[PDB]
Amino acid sequence: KQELSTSRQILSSYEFLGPEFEGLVQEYTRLKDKIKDNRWMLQELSKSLP
Amino acid sequence: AAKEKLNSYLDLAPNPSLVKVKIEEAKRELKATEVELTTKVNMMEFVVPEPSKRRLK
């Protein structure tokens, strides 16, 4: 009940910044996922030299 | 169900002007990780020689 209450209060502080902020959050999350995928690809090649 | 919604917001400061700067910084870091993929094909492997190696990670 206490973890549920704290999580709902932080959510309401972001929900007050309006719909345009929620569109910017979605755009940043989509960009951060692509950077993570590209870093993972580089890590697999360097394992193959003796 | 509440915790899974909050993880989508935590990397962003609650100021719209500062979020635009982080979006442009993430776009440049994407561009730099593309260019560091460039040159390390060429100076391919050179020198040393030798024996019985134990070691590594």
- A-B Cβ pairs (cutoff 8 Å, strict): 53
Which amino acid is located at A4 in the chain? L
CB-based contacts of A42, cutoff 8 Å, min separation 6? B33, B37
Are residues A25 and B8, on separate chains, in Cβ contact within 8 Å? yes
d(C-alpha A17, C-alpha A11), whole Å? 11
Please state, in angstroms and rounded to a whole number, the distance separating the CA atoms of residues A12 and B19. Answer: 19
Contacts of B16 (CB under 8 A, 6+ apart): A17, A20, A21, A24
Resolution in Å equals 6.9
Do A2 and B2 meet the contact criterion of CB atoms below 8 Å apart?
A: no
Is B9 touching A (CB cutoff 8 A)? yes
CA nearest to A29 within chain B: B8
Residue with tokens 């999580």: A7
